[PDB]
Design a protein around this ligand. Sequence first.
Ligand SMILES: Nc1nc2c(ncn2[C@@H]2O[C@@H]3COP(=O)(O)O[C@H]4[C@@H](O)[C@H](n5cnc6c(=O)[nH]c(N)nc65)O[C@@H]4COP(=O)(O)O[C@H]3[C@H]2O)c(=O)[nH]1
Length: 253
Amino acid sequence: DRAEEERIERWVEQLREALVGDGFLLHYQPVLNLQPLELYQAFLRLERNGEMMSPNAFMAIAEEHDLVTEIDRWVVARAIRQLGERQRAGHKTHLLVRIGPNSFSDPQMIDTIREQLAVYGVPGERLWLQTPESKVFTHLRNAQQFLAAVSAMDCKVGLEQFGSGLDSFQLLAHFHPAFLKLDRGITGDIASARDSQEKIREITSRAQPAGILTMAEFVADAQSMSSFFSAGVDYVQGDFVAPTGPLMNYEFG
Ligand SMILES: Nc1nc2c(ncn2[C@@H]2O[C@@H]3COP(=O)(O)O[C@H]4[C@@H](O)[C@H](n5cnc6c(=O)[nH]c(N)nc65)O[C@@H]4COP(=O)(O)O[C@H]3[C@H]2O)c(=O)[nH]1
């Protein structure tokens, strides 16, 4: 297990070098209104010796070695720079960015948001931050504090992998997100299954009057796209809309 630990060590070193040396980059997936906005989701990549590496390569090591906090700060800072450059170039771009629960209590994350929005002159509304519902359940106080701190900048905070149980309804009484992205477990077979269609309607019929935007992901076909619209979902993303890529060249309208 010396060879293995040496492998782990070199990934950790590489991730540290990527933070210092700009070795990460972002790719972007368009997010389309069903019920409009220039909106993309940021996805992280690592440029390691001619390969455009996915986080499937390294995130497990990052989490084991407590590097996720710093990686999410890197992504948010890079995202705000992108929003700033896009604005300067005449584009009203919005980005959806991932943060994990360790960021909820990280003063450097709030500092990064506050300071980088300001220096690029980007209104907070352009930045949407998403975290998995599962992590809010287990870090509720800190999540509420994060929500309050970043909503003071007009940023949107929402939940991904959102479920359809009564635990979710209870959470919404205590945590008011700007948006909800449905877990793929609910939406996978929306085109061919009635119980999925009903879970989605239970969520949209509550979300809509509460002013909470709803979102579906991994949309793979036209029948699925067509069915989210019926159920009242606000936004959709997936390879059938457009795949992740390096450029923001989607024509939204
Ligand atoms: N979410 C999502 N993904 C779609 C969709 N359509 C296609 N994809 C692709 O399918 C993969 C889904 O992985 P994930 O569950 O988002 O899981 C992600 C996530 O755990 C992590 N990840 C990716 N980007 C970030 C990031 O910016 N921050 C953090 N903290 N983790 C990230 O790496 C995993 C793999 O990401 P990728 O290699 O980029 O690969 C992504 C993405 O490129 C869609 O509608 N939604």
